C-alpha cells in the first residue's frame, strides 16, 4: 500500500462519505431563483434602495489593517455627529451598529461626511400625501462607494 | 371450526363470494384486458390462513 | 415553438394526456372541420362534433360518402355515421368508426347552446 516515489496523500474518505455528497446542480437554478426574489423585493420595497448605508471601517489584524471596507453600522457617535437620532436613522435606510466604537478621528470624520452626503442625496417621503414619484436607485453602496 | 366465531364465519362468507369465475360479459368490454379470474381459490389447493 | 414554461413538449406526457383524457375533454378533441360552404356561412373553421350533425367523409375508403352521425363514441375516440356500414358474412351490418378530423360538417345540429357557442366564438349563424 506504499510504492514508487509519490507524496503521501491523506484522502479522507473512510466514513460513509457518499451519504454526505452535495452537488450543485441548482447553481443556475438558484441564481435565477434569487434574482427574481431580489427584483421582487425591489418592487415590494417601493422606491427604497434595496440595501442600507454602511460605514467606512479599518480592517482588522496585521494582514488587512492596510485596507478598509464597509463595516456593519454607523456608531451612535457618528449618528449624533451627523445630527440625527439613531431610532430615526434606522428608518432612513442608514444602518446603525451600537457595538462599534470610535478610536479614530480620521475614520469618524470620514464617516460623518459619508453620512451627510447621504442625507443630501436622499428624499424622505412625507407621512401622508404627495409622493413625487422618485424612480428607485438599486444600490446605496454603489452610489456611495469606498 | 364448526363452532365458529361470527368474525370467522363472515370472512368465510366473503370467501365463497370471491370463488366464482369471471362474469363472462367483462370479456366483451372495450379495452378490457381480463381473460379470466386469476385470483380464484380452492378449498383443497391453497388455504385461507384463518 | 412553445415559449410558455407551462407548456410541455414531452411526448410521453402528451400520449398519456390524450389516452387518459375524460369525456368532457374528448369532445373538444373530437372537433371536425366545417365545410367550405359552412365556413363562409358561419365564419368558423371547426367545432367539436355533435351527435345529429351531418357530415361528409373527406378521407379514407369511405371518402365521398356522407350521412348523419349515428353516435359519437367517446370511449373509442370514434364517431359513427349512420349511413356508412360494413356487412359481415352472417349478413349483419356494423358501424364504421370514423375520426372527425377526417370528416367535414355539412349540416350542424343547432341548439340554443350550439348557436350560442358559434357567436361566442365570433361566428355568423345564417
Amino acid at each position: 500500500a506504499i510504492s514508487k516515489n509519490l507524496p503521501i496523500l491523506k484522502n479522507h474518505f473512510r466514513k460513509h462519505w457518499q451519504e454526505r455528497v452535495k452537488v450543485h446542480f441548482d447553481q443556475a437554478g438558484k441564481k435565477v431563483s434569487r434574482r427574481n426574489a431580489r427584483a421582487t423585493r425591489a418592487a415590494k420595497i417601493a422606491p427604497r434602495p434595496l440595501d442600507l448605508l454602511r460605514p467606512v471601517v479599518r480592517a482588522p489584524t496585521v494582514k488587512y489593517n492596510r485596507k478598509v471596507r464597509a463595516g456593519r453600522g454607523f456608531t451612535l457617535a457618528e449618528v449624533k455627529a451627523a445630527g440625527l437620532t439613531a431610532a430615526y436613522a434606522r428608518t432612513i435606510g442608514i444602518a446603525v451598529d451600537h457595538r462599534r466604537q470610535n478610536r479614530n478621528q480620521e475614520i469618524f470624520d470620514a464617516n460623518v461626511q459619508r453620512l451627510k452626503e447621504y442625507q443630501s442625496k436622499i428624499i424622505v417621503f412625507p407621512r401622508n400625501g404627495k409622493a413625487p414619484e422618485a424612480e428607485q436607485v438599486l444600490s446605496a453602496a454603489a452610489t456611495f462607494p469606498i | 371450526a364448526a363452532q365458529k366465531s361470527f368474525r370467522i364465519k363472515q370472512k368465510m362468507a366473503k370467501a365463497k363470494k370471491q370463488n366464482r369465475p369471471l362474469p363472462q360479459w367483462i370479456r366483451l368490454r372495450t379495452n378490457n384486458t381480463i381473460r379470466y379470474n386469476a385470483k380464484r381459490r380452492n378449498w383443497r389447493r391453497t388455504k385461507m390462513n384463518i | 415553438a412553445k415559449q410558455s414554461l407551462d407548456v410541455s413538449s414531452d411526448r410521453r406526457k402528451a400520449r398519456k394526456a390524450y389516452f387518459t383524457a375524460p369525456s368532457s375533454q374528448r369532445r373538444v378533441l373530437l372537433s371536425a372541420p366545417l365545410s367550405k360552404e359552412l365556413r363562409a356561412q358561419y365564419g368558423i373553421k371547426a367545432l367539436p362534433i355533435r351527435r345529429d350533425d351531418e357530415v361528409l367523409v373527406v378521407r379514407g375508403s369511405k371518402k365521398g360518402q356522407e350521412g348523419k352521425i349515428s353516435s359519437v363514441y367517446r370511449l373509442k375516440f370514434a364517431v359513427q355515421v349512420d349511413k356508412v356500414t360494413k356487412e359481415k358474412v352472417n349478413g349483419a351490418s356494423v358501424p364504421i368508426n370514423l375520426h372527425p378530423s377526417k370528416l367535414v360538417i355539412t349540416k350542424l345540429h343547432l341548439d340554443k347552446d350550439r348557436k350560442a357557442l358559434i357567436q361566442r366564438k365570433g361566428g355568423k349563424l345564417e
Binding site: - | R7, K11, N49, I50 | D113, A116
Partner: protein, 87 residues
C-alpha cells in the same frame, strides 16, 4: 421424528386476526399483534424494516380523508357554496 410425524400435531393457533390491522399476527397468548403492535398505543414499525414500512404507510390505503385535503387547500378551504353564471 422431529420431521413429518411431529407435524401431524400442529392444530393450534399462535395467532388469530388482529383487529387493528386484520392480519393474524395477533398472538393469542401474548395478546399482542406481532405486526402492528396492537394493543400498543402506537403502530409497530422499525427502520431496519423499510419494506414493511412501504407496505403499510399512508397511501397504501383509501385515504378516505387525506385524499381531498390537497384539493381543499388549493381552494383555500372555501366555505358555503357556489352561485351561478349562464347557459
Amino acid at each position: 421424528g422431529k420431521g413429518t410425524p411431529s407435524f401431524g400435531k400442529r392444530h393450534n393457533k399462535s395467532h388469530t386476526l388482529c383487529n387493528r390491522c386484520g392480519r393474524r399476527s395477533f398472538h393469542v397468548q401474548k395478546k399482542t399483534c406481532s405486526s402492528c403492535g396492537y394493543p400498543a398505543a402506537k403502530t409497530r414499525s422499525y427502520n431496519w424494516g423499510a419494506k414493511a414500512k412501504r407496505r403499510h404507510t399512508t397511501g397504501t390505503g383509501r385515504m378516505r380523508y387525506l385524499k381531498h385535503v390537497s384539493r381543499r387547500f388549493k381552494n383555500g378551504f372555501q366555505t358555503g357554496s357556489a352561485s351561478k353564471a349562464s347557459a
